[PDB]
Symmetry: C8
Subunit: 167 residues, 8 copies
């Protein structure tokens, strides 16, 4: 008929681990300037912990990000972000970018007249902030840029989609 | 069409004893550290009594739990917990975990922004607390962890589902 | 479609005498400890009188009851109780139990969080108390236990069901 | 679909005389103890007069009645009662009984919790009291017992049913 | 579907003269005791005048009437009455009787509990009083009895029915 | 389905001149007593002017009229009347009569209890008064009688009908 | 189904120039008494300017007009009028006439009881006045007569229709 | 069925770069009077920057514009305008023109009685102003004329359409 709201969100699976580690791409491909390559992508997942929480970033001047390569255009309804657990990290902002097809260039998340919006980070560590995105995000390659940093950035995340599903 | 609310709950059968004793799995597989192996799983069922109420746990530091192995992904609408009858036990909290397929790892019950919730235990023994779970729980293997303890934990339980059924 | 409320109740037939006397089972199978075997089951029926009202019970410490063996799982919408006519008997309480299939064990009537309810008896003799049961009772073998006693228990009863029927 | 209310009542025909005289049965089969056998059944019909109104009853201690033998289970929606015209007769009460099939025994009219009701008679003679019966009466053999008497009982009556009919 | 209200009334035709004169039957078959046989039935029709208005009646002690023989069971929705034009005649009352089939006996118009009603006549001559009858009158032979008289009775009339008709 | 109200009126055509002059019949067939035979029927049409407005009438004591012979039973929803233009003429009243089939006799316009109504004429000349007739007039031969006169009567008119039409 | 309101208006095309110049007919066929034949019909179109705005009229005593010959009966929903641009011209009134078929005679725009209406002209030059016509105008040949003049009349116009169209 | 509002807007793609550079036509075909031919059309796109923002215009007296040649009649629901980034530029107004078919002449955007509207420019540079156009613009060749200038005009833009799309 037409997309609804929704009524319920479908987590993709970062806690369940439906997503493969190969689809969590970290900025700094050298991984020695904006990462230590430890903590791994598997730690950078919602409620994943016990040996490191999040991904790390050695240098970061809001030109570091975390990408989710879905390799299929999917409809994303929200972005869950959770703090680390090593030491405290204060609220940041997010720039939501997405690209479909893995072609052309990237475009920005829009929300009303003004046509953009940044979402709040994690105020105090080891807690999840639920940033639901009202319009449906048609994305194949997602880029979540954390803007601002308390020392460095280190988030854990899971995406919410929507499957009707109905029973 | 789509899952409703519901309008009526369907007990699985712990009082009726539809569930086999083989599907009530207790933590501590040694059963001599977090159990005495007496009281049995049949006693640990809603309104089952006359020779022991609940399951016992010798040691427990909120790392003991009771699991319901359904061996079929079912839709759970509530968790009934009832106190023991030997001696008093005060309110505890619950962590609701579930896993489908008997694969991957376990995930947590979510309820709104903040994405978690713990449910209240039994305030005074030999009484049932009705903890209905608003969203439908898609689970094959259920883990109910009791958090906190008045000496030890010992609950009796039955699950509520939903069958339409209609007449 | 789905069960309604109802809009009208269908008496099974205890006054009409649709029920056979063979389906009214009295506690105390010895019938010389919790009965005199006079008054008979036919007297223990709604508005049946003229030679004894109700069934009698010599001893009773709330472990005497009256069962209706339907021998078919039926949907019961209410329990009518009427006092005796020999001498006065004051209000009692009822425990409503039912079992389907004539298998497993018995289960209790539930009504909201707390999951049980007892119904009021007959305040003053020779008068009918209409205890309607809001959810539909799926029962094959009904056990109505009278709790409390003014000397002894002695009730007359008829069940209400629901047939749509429509014209 | 289902019985309605109604919207209009259908008189059976006592004024029209659709009913045969053979279907108006009077109590006292001797007809010399609770009747004089004059006034006849044809006089005991709504608005029938000119040579005697109603049926008479010599003795009556509320164990005299008038029955309508329909010889077909019909749906009765009301009972019209009209006073006599010989001499005044004051309000009485009615007990409404009915039996279907011409088998088993008789059952009582029910109206709410308490499960019975008596209807008002004719306050002052030669006037009709419209006692509509809210639930549909499934009856084959109707017994209207007049309770109380100003000297004796003597009513004229017609039944109301319901045919949709629609045009 | 079912008879409506209506929304519009259909005059039978007394003004149009659809009705034959042979269907307007006057009381007093001698026509020399309760009529002069002049004024004729054609004058006794709504808005018929110029040589006598109405039908006359020499003697009348409310046992004179005017009948409409439809010779087909029709659904009558109202009775129009109009005064004469010779000399004044004051308000009377009407008893509405009808009979179907031209068999059995006659029955009375009913309106609510009390089961009867009389309608108002013409207050001052040469004016029409619209007496609509709320329930549909199933009649083949209509008898309109005028009760009371200012010297004598003399009305002009037309019946209203209902044809949907719809366009 | 059924006639509506309407929502829009359809002029027959007196201004357009759809009506033939042969269908506008004037009273006084001698045309030398209640007419001068000049002004012609073509002048007696809504907004027809330039050489005489309306039809004239030499003598008239409210027994002169203008008829529209439709020669087909049509549904008339209103009567437009417009004043003349030679000299002033004050408000009159109208009696609306109609006859179908060109058989039987004529009948009167009815509007509520009282069953008649007269419509207002033209207060001041050369202006149109819109007299809409709420119920649908089933007419083949229309007679509009002007009652009262300021010297004489002289109206111009057009009829309104209703065609759904819908687009 | 039936004509709507509308929801959107469809300009015919005078600005777009869908209308051919051959369909804009000016009064004064001599074109030397009520026109100079310069300004041309192409200038007399909504927002047409740059070398003369409107059509001119040398003499005009409200017996000059502009006609739109559609040569197809179309449904007109509004009349747009725009002022000239040479020198100021003050508000005028309009008489809206139309004729279908190019047969019979012309008829007037009606709006409620009183059956006519004139529309406002352009208060100050070079500005458009939107005169929407509530009922649908069934016209083949449109005549817009400007009544009153500030020196002379000179309007620019475009018609609004309605096409559903829907997407 | 019919065009909706919408519920969501579909950007054509100037940020995504769906539009080819060949469809962004700039006024001044000499490109040395009202342009420097640097900044290019690719810079004159919503959120395109890093080496020049917008298109430039050397001379401009509100007779310079930017056109979008769609080469297909499309339904445009809004015009996004964004400021430059070199130096500040203050709010301007817009004239929205469009032409379909690439034939006839151009027509103006209308909004209510008065039939035109200009939209607000960018108050302060490097910010987007969302000018949604309430009626659907049927256009093949779009001309956005900026009226007024703070030194010169230089806007970046993207169009919004509407695809239902529905999921």
């Amino acid at each position: 008929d037409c997309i609804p709201e929704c009524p319920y969100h479908k987590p993709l699976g970062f806690e369940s681990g439906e997503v493969t580690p190969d689809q969590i791409t970290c900025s700094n491909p050298e991984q020695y300037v904006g990462w230590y390559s430890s903590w791994t992508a598997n730690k950078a997942r919602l409620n994943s912990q016990g040996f490191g929480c999040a991904w790390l970033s050695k240098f970061q001047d809001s030109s570091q990000w975390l990408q989710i390569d879905l390799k299929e255009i999917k409809v994303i309804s929200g972005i869950l972000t959770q703090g680390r657990c090593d030491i405290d990290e204060w609220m940041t902002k997010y720039s939501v970018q997405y690209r479909t097809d893995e072609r052309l260039n990237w475009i920005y998340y829009k929300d009303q007249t003004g046509n953009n919006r940044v979402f709040y980070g994690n105020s105090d560590r080891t807690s999840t902030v639920q940033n639901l995105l009202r319009p449906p995000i048609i994305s194949r390659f997602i880029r979540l840029i954390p803007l601002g940093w308390h020392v460095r950035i280190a988030i854990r995340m899971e995406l919410l989609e929507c499957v009707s599903k109905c029973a």
